[PDB]
Design a binder for this molecule. Structure first.
Ligand SMILES: CC(C)(C)c1nc2c3ccc(F)cc3c3c(=O)[nH]ccc3c2[nH]1
Length: 285
C-alpha cells in the first residue's frame, strides 16, 4: 500500500518544527534516486526521549491515521527503521508552517483571522466527532497549507475519551502547556471536550494579538500573577486575558464564553462554527 515508506528512499532536506514527542523534518521521498520524488514531512521521536516515550509516540501515529478531514494535517504513512531504531510518521508537507510563525510576518485583517478561527473549530468539531481530545491546541500547533487553509497538527497529547464520558483523567503530564489550559485541567487533571474549547479561546486570543510575544498568554498571565497555583487562583477569581487592541466587543465575548469556569456551560465547537461564520462575514467589507 502507499502507506509504506522505505527509509532508504527518504532524503533529508531540513528540519521543520519541534512537537511534544517528535521533530518534524522535510524529506524528498525519492525511489528513482533522481531528485524528482514527492516532498513529505516526516516526524520522528526526539533523540533524547527514552524507551518510556515509545508507547505515547505510537499512540500519536495511531490517532492521526484514524483522522481524515480538510482541517487536520494529512497522514500519509509510516517509515519503519529496519534495525529497531524506531518508527517515523509521514505527513503532507505544508511549506507555510504554523499560524504562530505566519502571523508576525504578514498583515492579516480581522475577517481573515476569524476565518482561521472558524476553520480551527471545524477541524476540532470533527476531532470531537471521533471521540478524541487534542490537549495541545495553540497557534504554534496549527499549520497552514498553500492557500492558507488551517491544518491542525501535533497530536502528541491527543487521547481517546472513554465511551459515554465527557472527559478523560490524565495519568502524568510530561509537558503542559499550562497557559492554554482550563482550570479543571490544572486542578483536577480532568480534560473535557470543553477543555479544548478553552484552549481554542486562548488560540483565538493569539490570532487577535498576531502572536506578538509582549501580548502572549504567558507574558500576560505572569503580569496578572505578579506559578500554577497562582494561575489556578487567578482564574478561579474570574481574571482572564485582556481584550486585544482593536478587538471588537462581540469577538472578545466569544473568547470569554470559551473561558467560562464551568466546563459544561462553554460552547461546543459545533456551536462555535456558525457564530464565527457570522462574525467573519460581518467584518469583511
Ligand atoms: C510545531 C509542529 C510540531 C506542530 C509542526 N511544525 C511543522 C511545520 C513547520 C514548518 C513547515 F514548513 C512545515 C511543517 C509541517 C508539515 O509540513 N507537515 C506536517 C507537520 C508540520 C509541522 N508540525
Amino acid at each position: 500500500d502507499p502507506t509504506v515508506f522505505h527509509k532508504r528512499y527518504l532524503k533529508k532536506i531540513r528540519d521543520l518544527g519541534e512537537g511534544h514527542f517528535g521533530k518534524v523534518s522535510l524529506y524528498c521521498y525519492d525511489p528513482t534516486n533522481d531528485g524528482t520524488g514527492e516532498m513529505v514531512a516526516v516526524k520522528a521521536l526526539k533523540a533524547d526521549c527514552g524507551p518510556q516515550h515509545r508507547s505515547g509516540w505510537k499512540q500519536e501515529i495511531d490517532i492521526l491515521r484514524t483522522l481524515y478531514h480538510e482541517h487536520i494535517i494529512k497522514y500519509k504513512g509510516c517509515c519503519e527503521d529496519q534495525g529497531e531504531k524506531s518508527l517515523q510518521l509521514v505527513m503532507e508537507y505544508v511549506p507555510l508552517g504554523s499560524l504562530r510563525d505566519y502571523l508576525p510576518r504578514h498583515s492579516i485583517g480581522l475577517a481573515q483571522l476569524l476565518l482561521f478561527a472558524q476553520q480551527i473549530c471545524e477541524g476540532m468539531a470533527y476531532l470531537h466527532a471521533q471521540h478524541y481530545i487534542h490537549r495541545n491546541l495553540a497557534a504554534r500547533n496549527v499549520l497552514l497549507d498553500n492557500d492558507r487553509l488551517v491544518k491542525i497538527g501535533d497530536f502528541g497529547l491527543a487521547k481517546a475519551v472513554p465511551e459515554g464520558h465527557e472527559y478523560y483523567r490524565v495519568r502524568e503530564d510530561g509537558d503542559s502547556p499550562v497557559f492554554w489550559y482550563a482550570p479543571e485541567c490544572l486542578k483536577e487533571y480532568k480534560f473535557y471536550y470543553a477543555s479544548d474549547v478553552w484552549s481554542f479561546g486562548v488560540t483565538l486570543y493569539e490570532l487577535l494579538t498576531h502572536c506578538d510575544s509582549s501580548q502572549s498568554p504567558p507574558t500576560k498571565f505572569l503580569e496578572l500573577i505578579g506559578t500554577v497555583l497562582r494561575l489556578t487562583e487567578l482564574l478561579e477569581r474570574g481574571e482572564r486575558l485582556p481584550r486585544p487592541d482593536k478587538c471588537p466587543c462581540e469577538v472578545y465575548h466569544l473568547m470569554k464564553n470559551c473561558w467560562e469556569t464551568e466546563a459544561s456551560f462553554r460552547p461546543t465547537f459545533e456551536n462555535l462554527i456558525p457564530i464565527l461564520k457570522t462574525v467573519h462575514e460581518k467584518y469583511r467589507h
